[PDB]
Design a protein around this ligand. Structure first.
Ligand SMILES: *[C@@H]1O[C@H](CO)[C@@H](O[C@@H]2O[C@H](CO)[C@@H](O)[C@H](O)[C@H]2NC(C)=O)[C@H](O)[C@H]1NC(C)=O
Ligand SMILES: *[C@@H]1O[C@H](CO)[C@@H](O[C@@H]2O[C@H](CO)[C@@H](O)[C@H](O)[C@H]2NC(C)=O)[C@H](O)[C@H]1NC(C)=O
Ligand SMILES: *[C@@H]1O[C@H](CO)[C@@H](O[C@@H]2O[C@H](CO)[C@@H](O)[C@H](O)[C@H]2NC(C)=O)[C@H](O)[C@H]1NC(C)=O
Ligand SMILES: *[C@@H]1O[C@H](CO)[C@@H](O[C@@H]2O[C@H](CO)[C@@H](O)[C@H](O)[C@H]2NC(C)=O)[C@H](O)[C@H]1NC(C)=O
Ligand SMILES: *[C@@H]1O[C@H](CO)[C@@H](O)[C@H](O)[C@H]1NC(C)=O
Ligand SMILES: *[C@@H]1O[C@H](CO)[C@@H](O)[C@H](O)[C@H]1NC(C)=O
Ligand SMILES: *[C@@H]1O[C@H](CO)[C@@H](O)[C@H](O)[C@H]1NC(C)=O
Lengths: 74, 312, 226
């Protein structure tokens, strides 16, 4: 069940082709995770790839609006 | 500069490497070397937190449309090259202008260089196609000419100025980008700020390794030559001298690292603030975002750091 | 609607905090680091530092002064080194905490006592205000931000040509739903008929790339007709 990486070699976690957000950092891209059960180690994903329809004459303008209230501890 | 080298040092295998006698004797000094290991692990984690704070600011991963209709702005030098580590031209120039077994492991960074370059390319494409709305909320497309009209309206200059001088503006822009290319490729003394972080870490490590081969007042700077020559009673005095010396050296190095990492974290907080208030927006803070009235910025990654292009 | 959104968001802050305890990680890390440094300094008392035993009374008793002096001096060197390490750790940690305290001072004085345009200084999004809240060995803000949600496309154009003269919006942007043209503010869809009280003229059509054709209504013509 071995799996060699760039940070060492991970004994006891299967390599998955998928890529979800980083759960347990490992090193050099890899990020472990526990999902149904077993522990998986993959290459973390930076986020949902989202192009934008940019033209030279198209725009986007909001109509509604949310008033969010975030919290910042210091 | 944004991050340091995630160095880790093993107290035991450094001080009394491969000696149960010296290990046991060091054990009488208490939690000293556990303290040291915990400090260096704190530094090693803080480096990844620094890089995260600086770059990982965009929610999604934007990607420019291939139809490059940018009113004349070329942008090809900073957008990724799909034919390489998919980095941009100026990211590459920034790369190539920057240049042992004692428990001195060197952990790897958590965000590889290609993931860093993907992050800054996301930020760059979002900026290009959507101004600041992608940092203010959901990205809203808008033609680059109209975006630069907004920016011009920010510094107290009516839009018609741009809308009339668009061609001259695009020419000046692209010429300045080319000048940046030439400068970075010719006078490689521009990356001193990163190269000196690297040199300072290398010299700290070299001093730390040299200190291994000094007597500190003992008879032989080789623990094994002391062990294989003397009795436990006298060897204990000699080994005690060596342990005292090496531990003082290791503590000095770790304190230097703590101070330098505090400095680097100050610089990474400053880079995070700079990206948030400069790229993702347009700051009216004079001389904070380029000498002059500010228009936008474009981040470009670099080895252990970030590089902006303050378009003023 | 805005007041209801504000109250609902405050309630969500209440719920998040009252349920998940992993939100005060920063303050907890400060307290834990200090307590750990102190307990390490104390447990350093129970070390031999090379001496015959950590108990100073034991050394003083079981050895005559001439040699108990060197034993006790070795213990002194050990304990003094440990104490100095602790004081250095505290100096560095206090520098970092003062960095965070200067940051909190700046954040309160700009966010709370005013309204900062610095993007992502006062919570992701546009800033409205932010009320502080105390917390043991710290402070906690509630950055009331304004986020836009629902948007359409509205094919646009940089300016319009009415009588050969180019017309740019004084404060807004030109859009076209697909039927007619309108000028609206940049952050909230609110179309308005393109009158001369909203736009200003400059130059002509021979310059502005991507200009379009339309007639900008004038209120003075009907007042002259009537
Ligand atoms: C803006 O968003 C609010 C929030 O979703 C919309 O109001 C909601 O309308 C639905 C329709 O039945 C109700 O069920 C919700 O209770 C409403 N929520 C709130 C907070 O009012 C609103 O319609 C949207 N548009 C405008 C113009 O306000
Ligand atoms: C953006 O700039 C690049 C660099 O000058 C342009 O690519 C050059 O194009 C000329 C002629 O088209 C060639 O002689 C160079 O060898 C090209 N350089 C590179 C690095 O490819 C590019 O054409 C410009 N973009 C636009 C839209 O004009
Ligand atoms: C404003 O400055 C620009 C840039 O210095 C001038 O544009 C250049 O003018 C020279 C000589 O007239 C030309 O050789 C260049 O090709 C022009 N473009 C660039 C990019 O250098 C411009 O003439 C100045 N005066 C105006 C716009 O009235
Ligand atoms: C806007 O309308 C004006 C006149 O109603 C147009 O002006 C003429 O357009 C034709 C066709 O492009 C040209 O050949 C003429 O030289 C223009 N001027 C005159 C005095 O006839 C103008 O082209 C229209 N613009 C758009 C974008 O439809
Ligand atoms: C993951 O990808 C590797 C090749 O990179 C492949 O050999 C393996 O079968 C894949 N496994 C899964 C579960 O997709
Ligand atoms: C209109 O905007 C939406 C974004 O909500 C986008 O998905 C769509 O492609 C746009 N329309 C066209 C014709 O591209
Ligand atoms: C804008 O894009 C359209 C669609 O490709 C193109 O026909 C036009 O030439 C471009 N430029 C202007 C100024 O409309």
């Amino acid at each position: 069940n071995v799996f060699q990486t760039r940070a060492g070699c991970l004994i006891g976690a299967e390599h998955v082709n998928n890529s979800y957000e980083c759960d347990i950092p490992i090193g050099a891209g890899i990020c472990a995770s526990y999902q149904t059960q077993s522990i998986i180690a993959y290459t973390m994903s930076l986020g949902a790839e989202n192009s934008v329809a940019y033209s030279n004459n198209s725009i986007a303008i909001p109509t509604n609006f949310t008033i969010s209230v975030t919290t910042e501890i210091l | 500069p944004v991050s340091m080298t995630k160095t880790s040092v093993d107290c035991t295998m450094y001080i009394c490497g491969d000696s149960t006698e010296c290990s046991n004797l060091l054990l009488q000094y208490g939690s000293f070397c556990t303290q040291l290991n915990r400090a260096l692990t704190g530094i090693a984690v803080e480096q990844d937190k620094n890089t995260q704070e600086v770059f990982a600011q965009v929610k999604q991963i934007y990607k420019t449309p291939p139809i490059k209709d940018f009113g004349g702005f070329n942008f090809s030098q900073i957008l990724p090259d799909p034919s390489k580590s998919k980095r941009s031209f100026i990211e590459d120039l920034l790369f190539n202008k920057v240049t042992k077994f004692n428990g001195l492991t060197v952990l790897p960074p958590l965000l590889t260089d290609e993931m860093i370059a993907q992050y800054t390319s996301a930020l760059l494409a979002g900026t290009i196609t959507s101004g600041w709305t992608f940092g203010a909320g959901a990205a809203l497309q808008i033609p680059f000419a109209m975006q630069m009209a907004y920016r011009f309206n920010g510094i107290g200059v009516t839009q018609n100025v741009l809308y009339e001088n668009q061609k001259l503006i695009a020419n000046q822009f692209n010429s300045a980008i080319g000048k940046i290319q030439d400068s970075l490729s010719s006078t490689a003394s521009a990356l001193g700020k990163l190269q000196d972080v690297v040199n300072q870490n290398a010299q700290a490590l070299n001093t730390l390794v040299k200190q291994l081969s000094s007597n500190f007042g003992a008879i032989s700077s080789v623990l094994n030559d002391i062990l294989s020559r003397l009795d436990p009673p006298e060897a204990e005095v000699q080994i005690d001298r060596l342990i005292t010396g090496r531990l003082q050296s290791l503590q000095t190095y770790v304190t230097q690292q703590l101070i330098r990492a505090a400095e680097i974290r100050a610089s990474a907080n400053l880079a995070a603030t700079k990206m948030s208030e400069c790229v993702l927006g347009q700051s009216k803070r004079v001389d904070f975002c380029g000498k002059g009235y500010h228009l936008m910025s474009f981040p470009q990654s670099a080895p252990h750091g970030v590089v902006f292009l303050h378009v003023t | 609607l805005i007041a209801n959104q504000f109250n609902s968001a405050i309630g969500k802050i209440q719920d998040s905090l009252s349920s998940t305890a992993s939100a005060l990680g920063k303050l907890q890390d400060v307290v834990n680091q200090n307590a750990q440094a102190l307990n390490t300094l104390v447990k350093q008392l129970s070390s031999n530092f090379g001496a015959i035993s950590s108990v100073l009374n034991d050394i003083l008793s079981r050895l005559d002064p001439p040699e108990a002096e060197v034993q006790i001096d070795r213990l002194i060197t050990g304990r003094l080194q440990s104490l100095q390490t602790y004081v250095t750790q505290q100096l560095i940690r206090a520098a970092e905490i003062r960095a965070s305290a200067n940051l909190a001072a700046t954040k309160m004085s700009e966010c709370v006592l005013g309204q900062s345009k610095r993007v992502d200084f006062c919570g992701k999004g546009y800033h409205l205000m932010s009320f502080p809240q105390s917390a043991p060995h710290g402070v906690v803000f509630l950055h009331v931000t304004y986020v836009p949600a629902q948007e359409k496309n509205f094919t646009t154009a940089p300016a319009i040509c009415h009588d050969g003269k180019a017309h740019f919006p004084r404060e807004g942007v030109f859009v076209s739903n697909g039927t007619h043209w309108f000028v609206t503010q940049r952050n909230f869809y609110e179309p308005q008929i393109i009158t001369t009280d909203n736009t200003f003229v400059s130059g002509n059509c021979d310059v502005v790339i991507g200009i379009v054709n339309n007639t900008v209504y004038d209120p003075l013509q009907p007042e002259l007709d009537s």
